[PDB]
Write a protein that binds this DNA or RNA. Structure first.
Ligand SMILES: Nc1nc2c(ncn2[C@H]2C[C@H](O)[C@@H](COP(=O)(O)NP(=O)(O)OP(=O)(O)O)O2)c(=O)[nH]1
Ligand SMILES: [Mg+2]
Ligand SMILES: [Mg+2]
Length: 430
DNA sequence: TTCTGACGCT
DNA sequence: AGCGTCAG
């Protein structure tokens, strides 16, 4: 008991933009605002593949990974914005730039770890300590938490969503004020106050809305964030974990949504995260390996030690294009022209990266898929990246992959290529 | 018929 | 180094 760590040492938040690419397009084009709308890549095949969906369109059942022609069947008035196309491929530049706008605001409050194009973890532990001392013992008003939910409340002894939110918040604050709650619970609450401030700054300065999770570690903060989207933030306390996890499907937890999560369910014969507490650490290590076993044992108790890494900028810069079915590249000339198109986009992005961020990539990774392979990559080869030159890069990439071609004729490529990917990696200060 | 990007294993 | 997993 007294020596058992509870993982309540940090305050961590996860901030994630609401329907991010849609808001970027809605900021630019006011005709799209407050409408069912979606962002697609390409257009010819089935109207384009949807990658982002406004909450209004979600109500009609429109989702990511849906073809726009199918989406239009559920939502006839669906409005569509198309990703920019350059050199015959999708160009995500506008969204990466919007992302930087948001990340730079977040970094004013605390150290952040970019987790994707539209989300970052925040380590608020230090910021909270400072705000606590400033207060002098002052109680925390509900007015400071106008968009916060407390997961698990209200409980015990209104029929509208906002009323339920407030009743939960009141129960929580009443407990802190009394002194019923822990120091950790106070720290989380102050963390939520700062997170309100951060989300207000993002909205004021970019126009974009986001949601957030506040908890003691990255896994819980990420889980919390999704509980009340859009435009809300959720506090998940250590105390809330047993009830929360008791009916939480294992797949909902970050990293368990794939094959490992399926094996946990299958091997142990359980469904919910909370059921993991029955097993000893050694039992879990036996089935899932020393690292996974230790992580699972702690995680199902709400505990996780993964640090928020001080990293705002992506570690790699890459671009890729699929060539599905009949579009598969079947000639040497085709392969070279597309390697050049990818190389040109990469050069432009690398050159900008070097001016903005004082660094240079030193390795070029080339990846391809051959027709008939399920694997995202069939083959990956690296070479030196010594100069930001698209012609040189595309020539080098061709050099490293040319041996894969089995075709007896120099001009033909076999098997035909279904994917090309060029990635710049191994950055060094410049 | 998507286009990324982080990280683990060997 | 090259391959796989995971999350969108
Ligand atoms: N190229 C590409 N971009 C994608 C893909 N999937 C998502 N994106 C892009 C488009 C997304 O806007 C963005 C952020 O990813 P989320 O936060 O997972 N989705 P969102 O913020 O839209 O909604 P909410 O968080 O409120 O549910 O990444 C994809 O498969 N391919
Ligand atoms: Mg998002
Ligand atoms: Mg996201």
């Amino acid at each position: 008991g007294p020596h058992m760590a509870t993982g309540q040492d940090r305050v961590v938040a996860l901030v994630d933009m609401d329907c991010f690419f849609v808001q970027v397009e809605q900021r630019q084009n006011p005709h799209l605002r407050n409408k069912p709308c979606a962002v697609v890549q390409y257009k010819s095949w089935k109207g384009g593949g949807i990658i982002a969906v406004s909450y209004e369109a979600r109500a009609f059942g429109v989702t990511r990974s849906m073809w726009a022609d199918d989406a239009k069947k559920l939502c006839p008035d669906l409005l569509l914005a198309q990703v920019r196309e350059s050199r015959g491929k999708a160009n995500l530049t506008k969204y990466r730039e919007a992302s930087v706008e948001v990340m730079e605001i977040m970094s004013r409050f605390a150290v952040i770890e970019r987790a994707s194009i539209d989300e970052a973890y925040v380590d608020l532990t230090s910021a909270v300590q400072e705000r606590l001392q400033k207060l002098q013992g002052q109680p925390i008003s509900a007015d400071l938490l106008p968009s916060t939910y407390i997961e698990g409340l209200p409980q015990g002894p209104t029929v509208q969503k906002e009323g339920m939110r407030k009743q939960g918040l009141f129960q929580w604050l009443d407990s802190l004020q009394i002194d019923n709650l822990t120091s950790p619970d106070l720290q989380l609450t102050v963390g939520a106050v700062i997170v309100e401030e951060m989300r207000a700054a993002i909205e004021r300065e970019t126009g974009f809305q986001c949601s957030a999770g506040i908890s003691h570690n990255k896994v819980l903060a990420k889980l919390a964030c999704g509980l009340n989207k859009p435009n809300r933030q959720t506090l998940v306390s250590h105390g809330s974990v047993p009830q929360l996890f008791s009916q939480m499907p294992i797949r909902k937890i970050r990293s368990l949504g794939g094959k490992l999560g399926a094996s946990v369910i299958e091997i142990l014969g359980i469904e919910y995260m909370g059921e993991l507490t029955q097993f000893t650490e050694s039992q879990l290590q036996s089935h899932f390996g020393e690292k996974n076993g230790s992580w699972l044992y702690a995680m199902c108790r709400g505990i996780e030690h993964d640090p928020v890494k001080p990293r705002q900028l992506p570690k790699t810069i890459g671009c890729s294009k699929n060539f599905p079915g009949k579009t598969a590249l079947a000639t040497r000339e085709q392969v070279q022209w597309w390697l050049l198109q990818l190389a040109q986009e990469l050069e432009e992005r690398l050159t900008k990266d070097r001016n903005d961020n004082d660094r240079v990539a030193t390795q070029l990774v080339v990846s391809i898929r051959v027709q008939g392979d399920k694997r995202l990559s069939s083959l990956r080869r690296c070479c030196a990246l010594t100069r930001y030159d698209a012609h040189k890069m595309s020539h080098d990439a061709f050099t490293v992959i040319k041996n894969c071609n089995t075709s007896g004729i120099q001009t033909e490529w076999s098997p035909p290529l279904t994917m090309l990917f060029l990635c710049a990696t191994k950055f060094s200060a410049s």
